[PDB]
Each structure stands twice: as structure tokens, then as C-alpha cells.
Amino acid sequence: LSAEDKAAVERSKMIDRNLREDGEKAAREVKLLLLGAGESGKSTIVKQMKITGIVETHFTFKDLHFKMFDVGGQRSERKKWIHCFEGVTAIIFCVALSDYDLVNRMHESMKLFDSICNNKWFTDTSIILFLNKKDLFEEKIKKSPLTICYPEYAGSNTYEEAAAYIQCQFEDLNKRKDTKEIYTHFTCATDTKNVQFVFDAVTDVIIKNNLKDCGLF
Amino acid sequence: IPVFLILFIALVGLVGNGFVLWLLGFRMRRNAFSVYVLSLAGADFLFLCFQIINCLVYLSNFFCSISINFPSFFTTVMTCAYLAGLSMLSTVSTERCLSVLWPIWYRCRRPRHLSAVVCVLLWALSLLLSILEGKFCGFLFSDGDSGWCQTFDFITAAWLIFLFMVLCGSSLALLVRILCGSRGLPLTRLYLTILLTVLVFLLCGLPFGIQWFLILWIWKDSDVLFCHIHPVSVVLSSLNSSANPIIYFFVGS
Amino acid sequence: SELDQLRQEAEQLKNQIRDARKACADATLSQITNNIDPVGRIQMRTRRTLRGHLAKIYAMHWGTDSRLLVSASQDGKLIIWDSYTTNKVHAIPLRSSWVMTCAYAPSGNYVACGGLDNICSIYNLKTREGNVRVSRELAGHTGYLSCCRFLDDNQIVTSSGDTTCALWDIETGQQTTTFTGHTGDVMSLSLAPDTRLFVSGACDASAKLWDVREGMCRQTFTGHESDINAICFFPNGNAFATGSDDATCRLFDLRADQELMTYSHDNIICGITSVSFSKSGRLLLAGYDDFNCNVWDALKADRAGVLAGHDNRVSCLGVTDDGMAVATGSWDSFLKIWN
Amino acid sequence: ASIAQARKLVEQLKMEANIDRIKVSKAAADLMAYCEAHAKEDPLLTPVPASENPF
Amino acid sequence: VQLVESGGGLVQPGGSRKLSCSASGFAFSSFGMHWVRQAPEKGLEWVAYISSGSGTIYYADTVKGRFTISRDDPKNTLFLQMTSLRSEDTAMYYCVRSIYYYGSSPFDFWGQGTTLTVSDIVMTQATSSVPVTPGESVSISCRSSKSLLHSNGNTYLYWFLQRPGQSPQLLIYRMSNLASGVPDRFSGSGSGTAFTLTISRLEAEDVGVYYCMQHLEYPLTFGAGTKLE
Ligand SMILES: CC(C)CCC[C@@H](C)[C@H]1CC[C@H]2[C@@H]3CC=C4C[C@@H](O)CC[C@]4(C)[C@H]3CC[C@]12C
């Protein structure tokens, strides 16, 4: 080598050092993918977590750094950019319970859950599911039936039996129930248990990834 | 009759440990766990090539009768290789237990050079125990008293007992926590792999450290030991040696 | 209804176009070619291997001096490599990790990149102060960017996920020309060697030949079955090649306005992520997602080689302006230079 | 409305319908004549010996 | 870009001084740094070299053991420490910015220098002084002992210019390549060991002493100097 090539190799070695130092701290963070239909309470979810194509929200919780990607505002063909989120830790899927009889909005929510939950890129990815508006859901059970969405439904409509029917109707959508784990939560606009539920579902994926790091798969 | 078996198992174990050494040395990208697998291969390749050396110069005595008198420190670096290759199995078990029991620490707050410094201290203590056994038992150039040989020899056997206790304690705590609560985990392969590593470390890698280090002082009868117990026991230790590229690098990757 | 009559006017215009380009088809390219000698067996070895990326890489572009290259990946880095010595000349951090495209200016003073943040960022390499900083943010394009390509140091054409291409001027930041006409979102772009025109390939299964100075679509090319992911000009500038999700590459003319040849085999069922031509245009290299690149005799539709050095999806490739080398990058985080 | 969209469709196919297209034999012969005349300075078609090869 | 030096003053023989240089306006943590001597009547001499991130440190053979270089990456200052100050160190020292990748221009920005008076490959400038009529083409030659053409293709010859009362600056780096801010009047040619600077169509602010330096191997060695009149 020359006297100038040696300082080029030393420049490349410092660049290698900075690349290892950044890529080893991007691997200790948790990447979450927000999904859901329009007006399915995702803004209130970003509100409870934190306190023009992709929106990235950064928050810390119990010495764990979460980067959460809202990609729902970018309205194009989803099959040409969803493989970019292969390797996301968990998918936070937000469904509004009080949008059941509206225009039928649950059938596009179930169609989006069937599309995402049976994708080839998210075959192992755990899906947290937030059912978003229960306090308006009880006020709309007490005035309107649930048979607008489901003609095959036959059950008592008070508060707790229709919501379990919505939960099992969403849980039935995956062809594979053993490869991924679906974590379902009932939330309102005023509860502080949501980010703890997120952390508790993330900790299982962290345990499985730590076992994969130590050769058990 | 154990001799041709230990030659074949040692040759297969050399090519397995050398393939682990070359693939993980320069080809792949290493992480915080694979330093343990790489240095377990480095600990085990030495043991298997020294078993081929002793197998060749015990098999040439049977046919052509040369009886090559080797220097007496090859056995003590073989003892160093054996003790390091069991300390690597114990520290793999403890890192798996710490990865499940403290997962947020193991993901985020684990120091980036802990695996290297743990491997350097374990290799240094294995080398120190081997150097004291060679220095005070007669496996070196000089010679020490045989009354003080068995004291350091019992310290090495008690250290091997400590490694078995640490491997059982870590695999016990691992099995207990993955049976207390675990959702996404593939439980059957986990208890099968944990029970297989505990069984291999019991009935393959510690007959040799009991008969070479501990039975020779409490038994006092080499009429049935060195002709019967010793070659079969070093066959089972070479079986643990040929298993360790397969179990820890080849089933996973 | 007048709109049914207007749709039938569009239908008879399509019938006139289809019969007019059926009238020009007197011979295939296969019947013209196959008397000449085949290429043979192309055996290209991995001469270098660039390993500093830590995630899937999505794009690459060679320099015009055929020694420097840029590479963009999903850890938020685009690295400028010396290809001869495998030295990292620069490593530029990104404002958004989600980057699907990168480009290197023909002068060598700038790079551009873009992705899911809707923006083509432009960075100045030959800075007085030593580091690489952001020269421009090109915003206003409302869909994920698929391709960026420099015309000059002041002009860049971009391809987006909102069915539009866009010619910009860099020093004002303004979208001086918008190229509309696709109905599915446009995934690939390729500039002519004389930089008067470009071609863009979309999820319509259609490519469109545009015109940079005037600003509107000249010709439309149809014949694929699924979304076309890759496009590249022939070095004469009279032809181009597409690659899609059909396990097919195709060749099209600009003057004869038809399909020329389909590069397909029965063993490939999966897609094409990237295409580029050799310097003479004799062999077309296509990057696939059965993990390896194929080298096709572009005139005889043979398979001339397989570049099989990756163990994930080949996302990007490119041939030097000398014709000297081929860099192929992939989702396994490694660039390989082949020769 | 959709009347303007279909009007622009008829406008676009009306301009694209009348293009002076050449035959496919001439353009295939032109691509073959470009490839025959640049084969010697193609370093991938003919593998260059390792002195001139910088890789 | 702004490199300003400090630490001036006369000193006794056998004394010590820490010269400093404050950098601002550029990304100082990624630049290799040099110190370069100039005697009050003789041309330039190289002192010491620190690399980027302090990993490679070279000294000249006349300063090896006595001098000490030290850079401060967060605070952006570069120090040279003296001990055992001989009478051969009565000179003006210039801190030199340089950077090394493919296509870079090292030795491009120089400081204003500072004074301190104490109370290989050889370069031959082929003509000591040339009388100049303006508007005419001027050829300035330089000679080395070894071939400067390396096997990669480079030719490590660096043509500078020191205006009177002013700092030196880079004109042509690596024997042929024009620096930024320098017009197309100046050019560099050459072959094995014989080199030719060309100044076509000469104008004002072109009088001053020209230097040929080499970066093929260490130590870096200058010419004697070629003044235009
Ligand atoms: C202090 C003395 C006893 C140590 C020397 C021990 C010898 C036998 C060798 C054999 C293989 C070597 C290891 C090979 C691989 C690496 C990975 C590197 O990232 C850390 C050092 C480490 C872990 C080496 C440490 C030293 C080592 C274990």
C-alpha cells in the first residue's frame, strides 16, 4: 500500500466501527407496526403510548425503547411495501368496536385482519389486537342489535357476550393458530393498562428471540 | 477395541470442530453467543487431536512396536482442553438461563464484551488447574511430591462437580420458568434439548473426569481400572467431544 | 349516455392501435437472430464482497468512473464504496430508515435516495467542510418513492407510489413537470443515454415512454400479466427491458412499438426485482427472488449464466459504464462484484 | 367527473394512435447490428485477462 | 474553514512550548492533520502527522523523540509539544488539513502559521528563480530521486504556491489534478521523476515561491523553492 492508501484503509476501519456501533444499538430496540382501518382509534392509541408517508413515534417504557410505525396514512398498494416490515417485533392492530353497524365497517376490518394475519411476511409475527371503543359499544348494544353485522349470531346482547363474539370472530380468521400468538385487549379512551399490555406481549417475543440467539430456535 | 472406535469418533469430531471453526471464524457474522461455540470447538479440537496422537502411539505399539516416549506436557494441555470444553458447556447453560430469566437485560444491557472476558477467565483457570496438576503430579519437566498431587487433583474434581451443579441448576431454573409461563415458545424441543444436554454432560463428559481425577485415589486397585474402565471412559468423553459441533452449532444453524 | 360512446371511442382507438402494431410484425427477433453464434457459458466469479450493511439493502447505483458505487439499506445507511479496494469512502446516515431507492449523480457530486417518507433527499458529496450533508428535500409526491435518477446536477426524475412520475429542478425544489397516466402505482424508471426521454414501469402491467422536455406520454407498452418491478434501457436507446412478477422479462422497441422477446423459463415461478444490460447489450442480467441472478442472452433468449452467491432475495444489480463488472446486492446484506 | 377522465383517455390514445412505426425486422436487425459492433469492448462477454482486469 | 495557530514567542535553547491550532468551519474529527516547518530563508519541511481518530502518528527523523502531536476531537484543537529546542527549530510552523479517500485532495487547506524562534526521497527544484513577463507561458520543473508513480496508478506529487506575506495553498494535487478554487491557468504534467508545472497566460497574484512535495512514503519532502519575479 501507499502512504495515502493506508489512511484510506484507516478511514474505512473507523467507518466500520461506527456502523457496528449503530447497528448493535438498532437491534436492542422494539419495532412495532400500527395497523387498522380509518377512524379505528389509532390516534388515541398513539396518545396513550406517548404519554407524510410514514409516521414514527418513539417512546420508552421500563427501560425498553419502542419505535412504532403508523403506515396507514399512505394510501397505495400495500403488497409493494409490506415486506419492508418483515422483522417487526409485534403488529398493533386497532379495531373500533363502536364502528360495528356503520358503513359494514367490521367486514373491512376482518378483511384487513385476514390479509395481514395470513401474510407470508408476518407468518411468525405476534399480533396485539386492541378493541378500541367499548363505552360507546355498550350504548349501541342498548339501542341496536348485533345482527346487522352477523346474521349467524344468536346470543344475549348486554355488554360482555357480544364483545366475546367479536373477539372470537377476529381470532378465528387465521389458518394457523400455533405459529403466531394473538393478544387481545379491551380498551377505552381512559385507561392506563394499554402500554403495560404492549410490554407484556413484547416480553414474550423478546424471550423467544433471546432463545433463538442462544441456539434453541 | 475401544482404540479404533476412539480413532473414528476423534476423526469425525476433528472435521466437525474444524468446520465449526472455519464457518464461524471468518465466514459468518458472530454474535454474543457464538464466541462460546467457537471456543468450545477450539477447546475440543485440541482434545481430539491429542487423542489421535495417543491413539496412534498406542496402536503402533500393538503392531510395529516402536513405543514412542512423548513429553509429559501433552497430557496436561489435553487436561486443559478437557476442562475448558466442559466449562464452555456450563457457561452456555447459564447464558440460556439468564436469557430467559432476565430478557430485557439480555437484550439491551448485556455488555458487548462479556462473552470474551468470561471465556478468557475460564480458559485461564482451566490452564492454571492443568499447570498445577502437571507441576505437582509429575506431568511436566520437573517433579513434585505425590502427597500434594492428590490435593490439587481433588480440587480439580470438586471444580468438575461444581460445573455439573451449575449446569443442572441453570437447566432446572430454565425448565421451571418455561413451564411457569410461556406463550409462543416451542416447548417440546426446549425440554428435549435441555434434557439431552444434561444427559450428555452427565453420562458422556464426566466418566473421564471421575476416573482420571477421583477414582484413582479412593479406589486403590488398578487391576480392573486401566484395562477396562479407562479406554471405555475416554471413548465416552470423545463421544461428548464429537457431539458438541452437532448439538450446539449444526442443529441450530 | 355520452360516456358510453366515449368509452367505445377509446375501445376502437385501442383496436386501431392493436391492429396497427399487428401490421408491423413481419418477423420476430428470434427469427432474425438465431443464425448467429450463441454466447456460450458465462462464468462470473465473486471478485469482491462488500460487507458493512446490517439489514436488507434495497438499491445500488454505480458511478460513471466505474469505481465508486452507492448502496442503500434499511438500517438507515447509504454507503459509498470504493469497489477496487473495498474501502468505505462515505457512510451517510438517513433521516428515515425506510428507503427503497438510491441514485448517484453522473458528475459524482451528489447522491439521492427515497422511500416510504415520500421524499427524494439529495446529498452533496464534494463538500468544502468534509462531511456529507443534505442538499435538498424533494417533497410533494404523496406516495412511496420507487426510483430516483439524475439527469444533471440540477435535474432529477422521480417515480412514486401515487401513479405519477416527476421531473424536478433541484435548486428550487419545485416539481417542474408531472407525468401522469398510470393507474397502478409506478415501480421502476430508466433514463435514455441521451437524457431526452425516459421509460417507467408500473403495477398496470404497463410501461410508458415519456418525454422530459415536453412533459407527456409518447408510447404505452402492454403485455405483462402482473406488476412490473424493473426497467432498463438498451445502450442504443432504441429498446428497453422489463421484468415482472410473472417470472418473465420482456424486451420492447420504441420505434417498432411491440413486444420483442420474452425471457422466461419453466423452472422460475417467482418474480424479478431488478434488470440491467451489459455494455454491448448482448447479455441481460436479471435479479430474482429464488435467491440468484440470471444472465440471459438478450438476442437468443438462452440462459447464459447464473450468479448464485446470495442466500436471500437479490434486490438490485448494475453493470459499470466500462462494462467491467456487475454489482449485485441483496436482502442478505452483502454486495458482490462479479467479473 | 368521469367525462373528463374518458376525454383525456380518448385524447391520449388519439395522439398515440398515429405514430410512424417501423417494422420489427429492421429494429431486430438494428439491435443485432449494435451488438455485433460492440462485442470486442464488452468485458463481460469476453473475459479480459487479469492484468487489465482491475478486479 | 478556519485553522488558526497559537503559541508564538521567542524561547531559550533547551526550552519547551505547546503550540496549538484551533479548527472551525469543517468536520475536524475526520481530517488527518500535519505540521509543516518553514525556515525564514529556506523552503518547507514536514514536521509530524496525526491521522483521523489518532490511530497512526508519524514524525520526521529530525524531530523523532523530541516533539509530540496530540489532537482533541470534541474540542477541535491540535497541539504540538516541544522539548529540547535546538537552534534548528527557529521557524514558522503551519498546520495542514488533509483527508484521504478515493479522489480526495489532501494538503488543501493550510493555516496562517505561527512563529517560534529559539534564541528518503530528495526533491530538486530545477531552477531557483525565473524572471517573468506576464501573459506568457511559464514552465517550472522539479526532480525526484525515486519514481513517484505507484503501482495503483497515482503519482504523489503536490504543487503548492506561497504568495509573499501569505500562507501556502494547494494548486495541483497528485501531479495532474487541479485543486478547487484554482483556475485553469495552472496545470501539472510529468513522467517518471521529471515534473513540469505550467502557468499559461500569467496574471497578477501569481508571484511567489512554488513548492513540489511528495506523499509516496514518509517523510514528506519538499523542494528548495522556485520564486517568480
Ligand atoms: C489467556 C489464555 C489462556 C487464552 C488462550 C486460550 C486459547 C487456547 C484460544 C483458543 C481459541 C481462542 C478464542 C477464539 C475466538 C475468540 C473470539 C474473539 O471475539 C474473542 C477471543 C476468542 C474467544 C479467543 C480467545 C482465546 C482462545 C480461547
What would you say this structure looks like, in words?
The structure holds 5 chains of a larger assembly. Chain B has 253 residues and is an all-alpha fold. Chain B has one domain. Chain B contains ten helices and no strands. In chain B, helix 2 packs antiparallel against helix 3, helix 3 runs parallel beside helix 6 and helix 6 packs antiparallel against helix 7. The radius of gyration of chain B is 19 Å and the shape is globular. Chain B starts with a helix and ends with a helix. Chain C has 339 residues and is mostly beta strands. Helices cover 8% and strands 45% of the residues of chain C. In chain C, strands 1-28-27-26 form a four-stranded antiparallel beta sheet, with no helix packed on it. In chain C, a hairpin with a 6-residue loop joins strand 26 and strand 27. Chain D contains two helices and no strands. Chains A and E meet through helix 1 of A and loops of E. The site of cholesterol has 10 residues of chain B, from helix 2 and helix 5. Chain A: Its EC number is 3.6.5.-. Chain A: It is found in: Nucleus; Cytoplasm; Cell membrane; Cytoplasm, Cytoskeleton, Microtubule organizing center, Centrosome. Chain A: It is a peripheral membrane protein; Lipid-anchor. Chain A: It catalyses: GTP + H2O = GDP + phosphate + H(+).
Most residues in contact: chain pair: C-D, 60 and 39 residues
The bound ligands are: cholesterol
Could you state the order of secondary-structure elements of chain D as H and E?
A: HH
Q: Please work out how many helical segments of chain D DSSP would assign.
A: 2
DSSP helical segment count of chain A: 6
Fraction of residues in β-strands of chain D: under 5%
| SSE arrangement of chain A, N to C | HEHEEEHEHHEH
- Supply Rg of chain A: 21 Å
CATH superfamily label of chain A: P-loop containing nucleotide triphosphate hydrolases
General form of chain A? elongated
Structural class of chain D comes to: mainly alpha
Oligomer: 5 chains of a larger assembly
CATH architectural label of chain A: 3-Layer(aba) Sandwich
Give a count of the beta strands of chain A, DSSP E runs of length 2 or more. 6
Count of distinct strands of chain D: 0
**Fraction of residues in helix of chain A:** 25-40%
The count of domains of chain A is 1
Radius of gyration of chain D, in angstroms, nearest whole number: 23 Å
Keywords (chain D): Acetylation, Cell membrane, Host-virus interaction, Lipoprotein, Membrane, Methylation, Prenylation, Transducer
Subcellular location (chain D): Cell membrane
Membrane topology (chain D): Lipid-anchor
Family (chain D): Belongs to the G protein gamma family.
